[model samples]
Structure formats: C-alpha cells, structure tokens
Target: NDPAKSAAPYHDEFPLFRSANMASPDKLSTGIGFHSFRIPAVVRTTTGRILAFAEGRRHTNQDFGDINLVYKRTKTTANNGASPSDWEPLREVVGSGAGTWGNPTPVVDDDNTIYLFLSWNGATYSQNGKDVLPDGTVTKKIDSTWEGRRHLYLTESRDDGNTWSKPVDLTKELTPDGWAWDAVGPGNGIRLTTGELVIPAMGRNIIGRGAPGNRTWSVQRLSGAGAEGTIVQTPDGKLYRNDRPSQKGYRMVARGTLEGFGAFAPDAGLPDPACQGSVLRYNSDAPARTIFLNSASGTSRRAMRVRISYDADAKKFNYGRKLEDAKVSGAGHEGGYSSMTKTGDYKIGALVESDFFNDGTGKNSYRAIIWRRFNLSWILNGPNN
Candidate 1:
C-alpha cells in the first residue's frame, strides 16, 4: 500500500531530542543526555524497524569539540515510529573516546545489516582556526596532520540496530591522501536498484561492494558538491546528487552513474541557506516520485519544506509544503538539518533539527530535533502550484 496515494492527509510530530533537559517525556533508556543534538540521519531496517541517529554535542553546539555519534531505534513490532515512545531510549554508537564524531549517515543492506558512515576529528581540533573551550583553553585547527584532518569511520549493526560494532577508521582506504576536511551525509544513504550501496559524503560517494559487514568500500569523487549532501537514484536509473551549496543560495545538483558524475552546479529551483538537505526515492514505478526536503529560505533555516518531483530525473519540483503546515510542538524554531525515510507503516518519517536557542547563541544555546510523519498526499495537497 503506497501511502503516497492517501487522499486524506496524515501527519504527526513530536520531540525526538529534548535539548539540554534529561528528564523529558522522550525516555533515554540509558538515561544519558547531551547539551545539544544535531546532524540527523535515518534509515529503515530490513525488518521494518526505524533507526534515527545524530551527533550528541556534550559541551557546545560547535561542529567540533566533544561530540559523539548517538542514535535511537523503534521497536520492530511497534507502530513504526508513529509516536516518540515507539523509539527506544537514546544510545551511542561509538562514544568511548574524547573527540568529534559527527555526521551519522546510515544505509540498510538487504541482509538487515546497518552501516553507519561518520566523520571524525581529534578533540583538540576544530574546523575553523582555533577554538576556545568554555574553560578558555584553545584547540588546534583541523589541518593536514593525520590527527588533525577529518577522517572517515564505519560502524555496523546486524541485529536490527540492537547494538553497533566498534567503529573502524576507513580514511586510508576511502579518502584520498592529503584531504584535510570532509564529511559523510547528515542524512540516509540508498541502495540502488542494481544492489550497490551508496553512502553520500562531502565531495564523493562511497560505494559498498559484496555484502554488508564484510564488503569492500570505494569512493567515487564529485566536484562542486559541498560538505553535506545526499544521493538519490532517479527513476530513469541515473544517480542524482542534490547537495548544499558552499556559498550559493541554490542547492548544487549533479547527475551521473556509478563510475563518474558530471560537475555539480546550482539547482535554481531549490533555494537553500547552505544547510544540509535530504532526498528520498518514494517509488520507482509509474509516475515515479522523488521527494526532497530542505530549508527553503536563503536567509534562515526555519522554513523546512518538502517537494515532490513527478518526473524521472527530478527536472522540476512542485511548489511544495512547509513543515509548519502540520502541527508542531511549541518547543523551538523547527529547522536546520534533516533526514527522511519511509516508515514501515507507509508514511514518511523525518527527523528535523530545531534550535531552542534558550541559552545564548554561541556557547550555551541548545539544539533539539523534532520527528515528523506525513504522507505524500499531505505534501501534494499543500501550497504547491
């Protein structure tokens, strides 16, 4: 049953990450919490279970610093994330060390094994020049040094996300020598209709061969795509890369195959504020639809919008609907980064980042995430032209 065909719209929204508070209604099974959570990624397991992941920033909301890859999953036998309680308590994938572990881009293979691709940098390093900690201590800038440069790491789960294996560094194998800065998707990866798993990254796409857990991984480079991006295979069987622009107001778009991709250029139709966005292949059948979501405004990230392309290559997108079109908890400004996936029950389950900004903007502000579930009809019937 394609929920996309639902004439009557269906919508639900709730707080997934309860900001700086630990005692919020959303139970953290481990009872552990963080100062802020951002860079969300999500995927559905082979068993129809839902897995939502993000970076748990312990001290500040900065990209670097003490950050850990965190996640929560829905019970396999439940309502498929229809509510917050359908999710288990918050958990960490690889949090033993002191460093930055962000960008939780995940892909589910046919064997039910989940692969989480991440970006890491040492604790003493920040993306910009030097970073002054809350205690006034300064950290080095991300540089060419082995420990200073950004790295690629991989972790896996074979039990439907019950537990994740210790993350292993894949920088040497997947990244080119001398690459200083990079990032995996802040969204979900996709397995093409031909079987290869595609994990979206900053300037390239990582291809998984063989099988999950035990496969050879390689990178396919792309030019013009920014640090945060997502890949979707159009119904025409071509891969489409809709990425965040580094400086342009429009989203950068590229088309290609597994071997090579064309140069990335701005998509005049997709307005962005240089923030991460998400793309999902709703269905590849007749009238195939490709869904896209991003902060539709160039000046702010508060206007999260969703659009549906009725064509194969996604040449043109509908006027789309805003996330605010549905009911949202009056928690904070509901926008930033986002991740979207099809729920087991057929609706779209998305994790949209929100900035509470209760504290100050720089060092103390907290970030939370709101989970939204809506069907295709809800989007199609909106203010789309």
Candidate 2:
C-alpha cells in the first residue's frame, strides 16, 4: 500500500507561550510582563537549533504600543523542535524605556551569523499618529518630521542564538526618504543563492550581504505591496515575494532582483484575509520545491493551509493541505500571522499565531503562539498533493 494512503498522517504541535503566562511571577521575561504576544517569527540555525521570536505586547494587543522583542530557543534539535521541554525559557532580546522594538525578521548566514532586523518607534508615536513627540511626550509633538517616522534597526548573533549584539540603526541606509510608515517582516527572511540576505519590508525589500560588521544594504520596492511580506527564492534562482494584500483579497506576488522589483499581481491560488503568511524553500536538490502556509480562506482567518510548488520557477502552487485536518485540539485557532523554516532533519518548523478565546478583538481576546513540526511526507500524504 502506498504510504500516502496506508500510513497515518504525521504531525505534532506544542504551545510556546500564552498571553496569560506573561503574568507569571517567576518567569523573568514574562515578569517583565506583557498582555499578549503577536508577530511570530522562527528560524533554524546552521547548528540545527530552533529560535522563535515575537513581539511581547506590553499593554494591549493593538498593533502599536510599548512592545519588546522576545524569543525562546530549543535546547536540542530533537524531533525537529517538536518537544516543548526541549525549548529554553523565554527571554527578552530587546526592551528599553517605553518604545516599541518589533517585527523580528531573522536570517542565518552561511557563517552562522543570525541577522535580525526590526522596526522601532516611541510608545507615543504610532504609525497612525499625526506627529511624533520628540521626548516621547505630548508636550513636544513634532509633526511631519523625520523624527516621527518608523526607523529600521538590525542586530546579529555571531554565537548561534545565545546572545545578540546591540541593535544598530539602519534607517539612513535602508529606509528611503519621505516614507511615514514602515515595517520589516513579522516573519523570517531568506538568503538568496547569491549570498544576498533579503528581508521583506513594508513597500520594499532590504537586501544585504558581506560580513556581519561590514555589510552593505539596498532596497527594492514592490509596487502595491503591503506591510507584512515574506520572501523565498526559487530553485532556479529567481526571487519571489508573497506579500499581504493592502485590501482584502488574494495575496500579492512579485518577482525581481535586489536592484528593483516588478509590478505586483494577485496570487489567486493563495487567498488571504489580509494577514501575514510564510513561504520557504523546502528542497533544492532536484525537482526543487517550495511550501507556503497561511489562512487559506479569504473571508475568515480560521482555515490554515499549506501549499506546495514543484516548478523550479515557483510560478504555480497546486498541491495543498489544511493544517486543521490534523485534528490537534488546544492547538488553538490557527489564524492570523505565520512563519516557517526548513528544518535540519528535512522537516518543516513553523510558528503560527493562535487565538484562545476568539471572542472579541484586540485586548478583549486571548492570543498565543503555536509551534508545529511535520515533514513533506505528511503534507504529501493528502489527496490534494
């Protein structure tokens, strides 16, 4: 009998952390305290260690607030990061004053350097705010000024994910002028075949290469793209950016080089509810495949699906399977943002947003992050493959 039909599906999930856990009195990072966690991003280091990052929403689940970047790494690479016990205690990566340090988009380089790029802003100045408070005070509002804009920052870990260097401001080098709002990916980034590191950003792609300390940067804009974007390079070396749609509909797809990008078009195959999703290069050995994960329904953020593309160019993605079919209870509602990375053991490791209460929006609801581990065999076992 074919394994696809004879063997039972293979998959497992574990809860990384919850909004309520933030109130724990003993947990250091949690004690620093956050009302909820959002914007999940995950990556596997060259040593097979898995690192998961998120925005620790200090006060509310709103998009803007006093948020800090937090993370947890697996002690072992066992089962491709499936065992909850294998994960270390949560820790704060960056948190200072009442500002926001969010959008942890990380990429591991060939030399084992993990580059993490993020967006920073004052607690009082939001993307929706009309002005910036110079001293983070209402009395010192600076309207329509450069100081009011979202700034880009980058930090790196040369020793696996154990420690990170101080975040370096890259707003002058990466961000273009006159842009009021900007965000690096709330998901992991991808390194191209040419050794270039590309992090999906609002309106543009931040491309960098060379040694960590001496790296150079550039930007490429994807016309009509939205804030949250995820990128993956095809086997044949073409880069494809699957961006969240600004308006409700299918996700926008764009393809091009580091110098510039092409016009964006709706990816009808990938319907979205204007939420963040993840794309990763599964294998580049022969037929070369890619996988995409997201809320498959355009109407609701409930239907989470995984899709496979066999074409080396990654133009058409047909084989599809839904994560809900696994029937894992308490995995919470698999909705909202998602991030995926290819594992060292040839499996897929993903960090996806989950809703516990799902009763109301923002502060009224309970949210958490879920970690999932599975192989291509499990994904292909479905008839959809």
Candidate 3:
C-alpha cells in the first residue's frame, strides 16, 4: 500500500496531533519521566464537541513501564470536518507517582458528558524488586507485591471539559488480573440509539501468574453506575477471574442500547484467533454490517496487520476481507499498535507507529505516521461476506 494514497478523496490528512514536549537530557540522566510516543483518539461530544485525546509515553521501547497520559482538545469544526488543534494540555488527567499511564480512549454520550479510559501501571522499575528463579531465570515483581497489578481507570467530565472527576478503578470490575503489558484499553466507544455506552477492553492475565510471555483479550461492558461501586482492588490478585479460559482468542464485542441502563455482552462468535484493539461503527447504509479494525499477527512481531470484519447474523464476524497487511517497509522498520478514526466523508484516518526492529540502535524509537483512505467501496462490497 502506498502511504500517500487516499481511499477517500474528501478524506484529507490533517495534523491531528504531535507530541509537544520532548524529554530533557537531564531527565534522562536522572531517570525522570520523558515522553517519546503518543496515541491519538477522537470522540464527538453530544453538544457537538469534536475532541481529540492524545496519550503520550515517556519512552517508546524496552522502557517497559516508562510512560504517562496527557491530552489536548480541538474545537468542533463546521460541516463536522476534521477539527484542527487549538491544543492545550489536559491538566486534569495526570499520572500518579511513577506509574505508566497512557492509552486514553474517550467516549462521549448523547448528554454531552465525556468518559475517559486509561491503562495505568504505578510501579516504577527502581521501586519494583528483581528476582531470579532457581533455574537462573530472571523476573521482576512489584517491590511491595501490591504494586504490579495495573488496571484500567475511568474518569469523566460533565461540564463540557471544564472539570473532571477523579479516576475510579474498573480493575476489579472487569480486569481479572488487574495487570496487562502493552495491552490496549477500551477501543472507540459509541452510544447506541438506546442511550447505553459500549466501551471495548482487552485483558492480558500475565501479571499475577509469574509469566510474561502469553496473554488474552476480552470485551467488557460499563454499567451506568458512574464509576461508583465499580471500583474494586483484589488482595489475592486472583479474584474476579474469568470463568472461560478455554475459550481463548475468541474475539467478543459488547453491544449496548440507547434506552438501557447498562450495556450487554453479545458474542461476535469469531474463531480462536488472536486480535488486538477494535474500532466500531454502525452504518445506516449497511445496518447489518458493523465495521471492525484490529491488528493481528501475520508473520512477524513487528509486522502486525489490521483486518476489517463484518458482523453477520449477530453471532460472528465474517473475516474474509483484508484492509491492510504486513508488508516490507524501510530498512529495519516495521509497524504495530494501530488506532483508527473515520472522517465525515466516510474515509478512515489511520495512526500507526513505524518501529525499528533489531537495527542495533541502543534507543528504540518509533515514528508516527497517518494514512487517509477514500474509496472503501472496494472493501464495502468486497469479499467480507
């Protein structure tokens, strides 16, 4: 795929986001926080506010837990066009202590209230203790044993971005282990015609199990309880475990209605294949088809690709279409961790990180690039039957 080509003509590439602050050499020397990468998410508020939230990280790779969350806003534009940034730092969504907080995906309801979802891990490497097994395998666990579990946190603002409530924990509510590594939190959330908000989440259970190599994903619902009584923390770090571990790699989708108090879980019934992150859209032209974009392993770790699937019979997604595939990029460069948004013209705005794999550079840096597609007609009527 040519990076310069557009699938939708009316869809133009706009400068939606960029990291404003850079890490200081002194901070690098002192081991203080330094931001390197940022994730971009867009949400439309009910009062017609089109906001973009960009979550930044301290370092890109091998910095394991070095990151934080920050955001900026854009004024809603006319014609519902892509709003340019009148960017300002969102001071309300700051990181706590040494925790790596980022991957902020916002969902705005019809009432104009804004809900924020973030992936947070509070233990710093210096504070977390290091361990070596009897067989000479090395591992790092939380120093106090209470520090390792990372949970998805929720916070919202009702006053149209003027004030935000403190973050409430959903770790105990949805996350079984309360910790995941490089896991994407809820994908783009939408309010159906019935008023229910459906947010997407993925759970990776490698934290408490003393192994870091394997994990899994799930899609959960957020109740109307408003973050109260939804907050839970576990003492044993194993309570709230999912009952269906054998059903691994089955991608699920949480469907909600506009008139309902809470969202309901509807099994997409896709097969046992690994996928990450999701973007959902309800199409009027194609009522039965819910467009989903997620990254999956195609060939290599850095060569992750995105597939577009259509919901058929409300039970499974027909994955007979390939929107984008892993291809050879520049020398020593690959791609991973994609987030997508749609323009008013029905084109897709894709944000992807081009990674440098094993280039022998001491610093693993990723470059952010955006792809704008115009004619999805080929995909709309294509093989995803």
Candidate 4:
C-alpha cells in the first residue's frame, strides 16, 4: 500500500522529465544564487512547448519581500524543452508594494487564453527570519512588516507569451469578507460534463478560531465572464466545515485546502500536508478513477505521496501510496506546488517545486518528473478494465 517504498525509474529529459531547473532572468544568474519562491504551474501548449508560470524572487537586501511573476518556455525539444539561455525578461506582473508575489498557477482555457491565479502580499516573516505572526497584526515598518495579505489575482495572456491583460480583482467579488488570511485561493478548476467550469478556492479564515488551531474550509464557485458566485457550502464528507450550507457532495482531501485555481482534482479527500499545489487528474477512460499527489514532510524525511480514488463515487481518496517518494538529486528542501498531465494510460508528465523558502536567499529550483503506469493494477482499477 505504501507506494513510496516501490522503486520506479523516473524519466530524466525535457518534454518528459528534467531535474530541478532554477528560473532566472539572465544567463549570468543561470545558477548564481537566489530563492525560487513557492508553487509553480506548468501546461503544455498546442505547439508542444512546455509553458511554466512561477513567482521569481529578485535578490534583494530585504529578507523575503521583493519578487514578481516571471514566465519562460522550452523553445524546442532540442534545447531540452527550455527557453534559450538568452531568455528575455518579461514585464513585472504585479505592482511593487510592501507585499511579494507568492505562488502562481496558470491555465489556458478552451479558447487558448492563458489565465493566471496567484497570491500577492507584503513580507510573510519577521526581520530575524521567523514566520510572520499570524495574529493578524500589521507591522509599522515596511521592510520589517510581518503581516502577509494575499488576495488572488487573475491575469490573462492574449497573444501567446508576448502580452498579458491587467489582473482583474476576483477576490472581493468572490468573497465579500475580504481574502481569507490563511486560505489559499483558486482550487484547480475542471470543465465538468455540462461544460461548466468548477474551480475551488480555499477558505482559510476559519483557522485558529475560538479553539487554539481549529481549521475549516469553504468553496467559491467561479461563474464565467468575470462573475464569481459567492462562496458555496462544500460537501461535508471530510476536511473543513461547509460554509454555504445548501451545497454538498464534492469531497475534499485531508489537510488539503481548496487552494490553487485552474487545475483539476482527481478526487477529494484530505490534503496530505495541509498545503497547496497538490494535483489530481481524472482518468480519461474511467469517469470515477482519480490520481492525487501530495508533497509533505515527515519527522525525519520529506517526500511526495500519491493516492488513487478507489470509491470516487463516495468522494474519498485512499492514501499512504507513494508513487514516487525517493529523494531527488537535491536534498534538504522538498515539497511545494505540483502539476501533472497524462500522456497515455500509464505515462504521466509532472512539474514540482523543490524549494519554497520565504527567508529569501537561495535558487528557486523546480524538478520535472515523467512517470509511466506499467502496473496492470491501474488498468484493473480503471473504468475500461
């Protein structure tokens, strides 16, 4: 049952799987030194190029506050599916304020338009490099401020990677209570059978309530065309309490927040690490079968966990399966955001962040993993079987 114990050879090339490649502006900083902020999202373009969206931290004297959105792509399979060493720097995505741009998840809609969702805010820690006080106190000093106010921002790509529309404010219209402090917004969205888009955003405001560290979750519906329905009640299977009250049925992952919009949830249950960027993909042939990935840390080791939905009809994911948990080339930093695409029945392409330190001094590197499903068990568990 423990998938991590199983040894499987991971693919090691571009367009398939590649080692941790840090994102930087110029060739001078190819491997110089800087912190790769948080979660990064990747989607293969129609031209067969891998498009990756992530927040790049600019090396600054300040602890961990200066960073913005930067994107790059693999020109061809020849260059290892990455932009040439002379990749140009795009315009800064968000305005320069006290806050730093955190995790960014991107998706290209049916019309081929790229939509980006990310967390924006000030410093998330103290001058001494400690996690900013979550007590909701905003510090006076700009550089030393500890309160991180992250509201979800949505930007669109009109002409490929050359241009992007100004970010539209989707948080206020979605959640009138202002953006939830701890809730990571924009759950990976999926186009349902009815052609309607269902994206789940986390309601983390419920954390640390009257009880010491109690947590609850809520769901927000992203109605098309700039209109987002108010937060709806999530199904009470497990995870956080339902806030919308009338809605129910969809299940949530344990410790998983409805964070990171624009991706699909293979099934629902608890978040393995109480974090964001966990990914799930619905088996194309099977309507009910689902696969999920979680990057979490144990007492002595950090590893990634995979789970498949046995009884997806009931909205739950069976866990403790480690599809690929062995240590990658890098050590020390593990777990952040993740994304996956199924190439065939057993073949899958994945992009995961290897580091997520907000302290502000390291190269922000990400590793890509390509896995093929060779086991007959997957077929037996799938629908066509």
Candidate 5:
C-alpha cells in the first residue's frame, strides 16, 4: 500500500460505549455504568479536542426512557486516540432528571466555544406514541406540554470541552410555530465558511449569526428533510443536504444556501435504511472532497459504508468502503446511527453504533458505539467491498 499520501490508508478502531456483558464497561461520573448508548455524535473542538456524544440509554435499549446526553473526551492530542486509555472517563451533560436529553448536534466556532443543540422530552413520552419499559411501565404519547413535546435546547462549552453550561431551551426561537416534533441532529453540525453555524434539524435548521457565545439564533425552514439530517458546505461553496429519506430508500438530496433550500429528491446511488448518516467537507483546498458514512442499504442498517465525493455538489461518490470490511475484530454487527469528524491527527474519526446481539427478534440488547480512525487511503484501498 502507498504511504506517502494524506491519511494514506491506515486504520484503527475501538469500542467507545462498552456494555456490562463485555469485559469492561464505561463507568459514568454518575456512579452507574450505562446499559446502552445510541445516537452518536462527534466533533473536534477548535482547540483540537475530540468530543464524542451519545444517548446514554440507562435501562434497556429503548429510546425514550431515562436517557441522558453523555460524552467522553480524548485526553490528549498525542496519539490521535489510538488507545482507549487516551480518553477521559464518561460524563453526563444533563442527566439530572428522568427526562430524555438526546439528539446531540454539536458545532465548534472559531473561539473554541462548542454549541450543542439537543432534543428534550419527558420520561413518559415517546415519538411513536408509546414505549413500554423493561419494568412494564407504560409511557403515554408525547403531548403539548413543554416537557412532553419535543423541544430544542442549546448548551455551550467555553473553556474547551472540559465543562458545559446548563442547556437553555430555545424551543420558541428555534422551532417553527405549530411544529411539535423538532430535532437538532443525531450527528454533528458544520460551521460554515461564511461564518455562520448551520445545524440540521427536522423540518428546519437552526442558524447562528454574530459572535460565538452572544449570537442570535433563528430557524431556517426546510420542507422535506428527515428526522436526522446532515449538512455540509461543499468545496464549491454551496450548501448540501443529504438526509435520510421519509421512507426506507435512497437518501434525499438538496442544495442551497442558508437563506433557503431547493426541493429535496432522492439520490438513488446512496441507498439508505432510513438511518442517520454523517457528512463532512473533508477539505476545501486541494484534494477537495466531502466524506459520507451510513448504512448503505435500503432495507437494513447492517452494511455501514463510507464514500468520498470529488464534486462540490457531491452528486456522485466513489471509494465506498464498508465498515464490516475494515478488519476490526468483532465489528461485523455494526449499524444504525453514526457521527463523523476530522480528528486532530488528520484522520477521519467516526462513532458508529453496534449491538452484540443483533438477532432480528427486536429484544433488548446491549448497544455499543465503536470509534474508527481511518485515512483516505484506507477507504480508497479497501478490499473490493
């Protein structure tokens, strides 16, 4: 394999969210080890620290229980997160009450302040009208109350990602009128080259203008984006939205500026299982490229693939590499949501979902998030996958 080029084909992976069934589980600062974690999001701060966030499913693997916004940060920039010990202990962002704080969409500004956009709902609320807990407790449908309806909240990290300010509810300002089910992102958001923050949300986008911490927030309405949308300012300087479709099929694609969006249509080449995917503008300079990762299958989340696009519009992608072919041991069962970010050492760092027990029975299984570090060459030179 060639080694002279950028990220010239090296790869490594480790589990970020370990379950009790495994030999080692991540112990949270709350003194309890989470049973599961889902909806992964990651971002490298402006100061070079990589923050990986997820929904710490406290009980069984249900989505609407006492879930918390949890994260682990890389301790040093010394080795590009090559070792599990390189990461700090897990910490809760806002797990105080029994409500759910999820959909962690984070963006980093120029001053190292990180803005985390989240979706909050009460413990007894579920998006699909109801959720029966493992303890046989029943949850009612989410309603019009502030705690019941899905709300958009924002939190900040000023002194790097070491600490976070209490999340402030921006439901009125960021969510459109009459919109009940608003979400930030299950992935990361991009800080535009034009100096604005573009956070992809369902039905709309949360845009930030002015300075980092003191900026005003508003919603930019989108008509047909999915629940977990991803946006990127491609090399051509145009905004691109490749979101999970309303139905299980190809990803919906849209192109526009921050002001408005063109109608979204399906990109048939990018087969999706109605799952959250992440896109990154790999670089704007030479070798200008955008990278996308998802479960590249129309009917399943089992085939996680990463692709690269040379065109600014990203109409077509090549170098599709499946994570199952990444040579990581025991990684054959990864699927569902994922988040991508460029690491401090110039490799692509992604947190992808997995389940040790993926038998199609839909029973409660321990979930894990795997951290993968790979280079362009790794994706480009993978086995014929």
Candidate 6:
C-alpha cells in the first residue's frame, strides 16, 4: 500500500543521539562522551533499510574539532521508519585520526551499492579560523596552501549499510584548483532518473559518472551559489539547487542541467538564518511535487518549517508548516542544520539539529540530533501545508 497516499496525518519523533548519555565514553562507537552530534544525513537502502549519518563532535560544539563520521541503521523496517526500536545502536563510519571526517552525503546506486562522499580536513583548521586563530589562542597554524585545503573522499558499502570500505581520497580529481575551502554536503545526495548521482558541495555540484564502484567525477559550479548546497531533480528531469548563501538572510536558488549550471538569485520565500536546509523530490509519477525544510525565520533558527511546492522548477513554495511549537526552555533552539530523504515506504525521514546550552558560550549545552518521520497527509493537513 502507498503509505503516503493512504495513511492519515501521521507524525512521530525519535531521539537518535543525545548529549546526556554516552554508550561508550572512551571509544568512538557507542561512545556517549562526544560533545554533540550535528550535520545529519539519512538515506534508505534498496532493501528497505534506513541509514542515518551525522558528525560526532568530540571536543566542542564548534564546527571544527576531533569530529568523526558516525551512523545508526534500522535493524528492521517499520512503518516509514517511525518505530524507535527498529534502529540499531550507533556505529562509527570513519574516524581514524584527529582529522575531521565530516559531511556524510550518501547516495544509493542502481546496483544497491551505497556511495558516501565526505569532506576531510586537519583538526587545526576551521571555517572560522581559516589558517590562523582569530583570538590568537593557538600557536600552530593551518597549512592554508593547496595541499592543506579540504579534500574530498569516497567510501562505499557493498553490503547495505552494515560495513564500509576504506575512504579513497579524490581531492585531486574532484576539487578544482585554487579553491581554499570545500565541502561535499552536510545533507544527502540524489540519484537522477537518468541514473546519475549528484552530490551538492561548496561552490559546485560533484557529478558521478559511470557505474557504482567504477566511476569518474565532474564539477558543475552554480553562479552566485555559496557553500552548503542541496540538489533535487524536478519531474521534468531538470536539476535545481537551493544553496545557503555566505551571508545570512535568504537562500540562493539555481537551476541547471548535467551539462552546466545557470545563474542564481535569492529565494524570497525560503528565509534562512544562514543555516543548512534540505530539499527532496516527493513524487515523480503523477501529480509530482517537491518538499523543502528549513528555518523559516530570516533572523532566528527557531522557526523550523516544512514547505511544499507543486512546481517542478521550484519557483514558488507554499503550504508551509513549522516543526516545533515552542523551544524546550533550556534547549538553545529547535533548528540549526537538517537533512531529509524520501523513505522506501513513501514518507519523509528527517534528522534535525536541536541545540541547548547553559549559557550563550555553549558551555554545558546539550546539542543532539532529532529523528522525525512524517507522511504527506501530515504535511498537507497542516494549516500551512
């Protein structure tokens, strides 16, 4: 049965990673001792299994740290991945050294092989500090040179999400020259109807050519688009990239084909607080549609919302619905970065960031990832949807 079409308005939330409990404080996997888990990306395998990926921030809540790529997968399939018990314990994807292995952007190929693209960087460098610390807190400096820049990596799981191979660095082949900072995606990738895999990245989209394991890559740069971009294919087969601008306020929208990309402009309706958002193609058969989720408020990350758009071009988005009614008092906010994927059972599965802090400095804060499953009826029945 088509759960999305037949079911009533259904909504559920599950806690994947909580800052309070460390399953294994001393070890990476099962370690409950990580400072926080952020930047979530979820993907449903060909066999009905759902995999959730995130950045396990070890030292602090800041973007740069001894961060490791971690994940949890469903042991058994439930109704739209709604049952919390269906998921297994947390596992580590990649974290060999203190270097950062982040941005778990995944895409399942036609042959059931899952390709995960990651962004790797040294622990000393960060988006904020670039190469040198702003406050002069550190004596060591980041390389900042071409070789020291962020590198792109690829790892594949031949046996569903159970095991993954060693990461192969593809920075020289994937990343262009002179690009200082680069990121694949803090979200999920998309497999176009033509069997092409497109992963959104900083300043450009990484296109995967050929089959699953043996494939070359190409870059498609979107004009005016900044870092943190998400791609979705329209019913008409065209690709649309909704990007996070370098400056705060609104999102930048760009349209293009696999051959090349076009110009970009601010999307007036999708107000962003300079945060990462997600976009997915809901249905492509008939009555095709697309869905977008983000912090609707321009200035604050509190108003996380889900919006629907009937147009394939994604020129307009209406029927918006906020995710949370109120903040959790001590919790910093309900939203920050989010990732969404269409489930195998015809529903939307999302992993959203919920931050908390004792003070504004992120001291004693509880930063965790929230897993949510909802159907189309829930979105459509909402006042905005």
Candidates' C-alpha lDDT? 0.85, 0.78, 0.41, 0.40, 0.83, 0.78
TM-score of each: 0.95, 0.90, 0.59, 0.57, 0.95, 0.91
Per-residue C-alpha lDDT of model 3 across residues 1-385, encoded as one tens digit per residue: 3222234323333333332232211122134433344455655555543455544455544333546555444444323434333333344365566456666666665556677777666534322335332234444654323356556677777776656678877666555543444233433554434334445444322111111111122334334211111110112111121111123343343322222322223233433223233444434333333444443333333433333333332334444334333233341243444455554544554544444334343444533323333334434444443
Full-model lDDT, candidate 1: 0.85
Over 1-385, each residue of candidate 6 has an lDDT whose tens digit, in order, gives 2234456877777567665543432234444457778889998888888988988887567667578888888887554467766777778889887768898899888888889999988766766563333244442333457545788899989887899999999888888876667888878888899888899998888888897656678887666777788999987789999988777888889888998878888988888989899999888765778999999878887688887787868789875677873223333466888988878776788888887754454534657788888778777666654
Model 5 alpha-carbon miss at residue 277, Å: 0.4
lDDT of 4: 0.40
**lDDT: the better of candidates 3 and 5:** 5
Better of 3 and 4 by TM-score: 3
What is candidate 1's lDDT per residue for 1-385, written digit by digit as tens? 4445547888889888777753473324576568888888888887888899988888778887788888888865457888766878788897767788989999998888899988999878888857787667798878878989999999999888989998999999998899888888879889989889898888888998886567788889887777888899999999999998888498999999998999888888899998899999988776688999999988788889998898778998988898988857656788989999988777888999988777757767778888999988888778654
> Which sections of candidate 1 miss by over 4 Å?
1-6, 21-31
Model 5 spans > 4 angstroms off: 1-8, 330-332, 358-363
For 1-385, candidate 4 gives per-residue lDDT tens digits of 4342243533432212222243332211244322333345555544444555555555432324655665555555223343234223333455455456654555445555555666566654332344333344444332312243345666767555556677765555444453334223322333333323334444332111121112122334322211111112122222222111112222232222334223223223443333443444444343444555554332211355555554433255565344343334422255444555443223444555543233334233332222222232432343322
Clashing pairs in 5: 9-378
| True-structure RMSD, every candidate | 2.0, 3.4, 10.9, 11.0, 2.1, 3.2
Candidate 3, run of 10 with poorest lDDT: 228-237
Better of 1 and 2 by lDDT: 1
**Top lDDT prediction, candidate number:** 1
Between prediction 1 and prediction 4, which has the larger TM-score?
Answer: 1
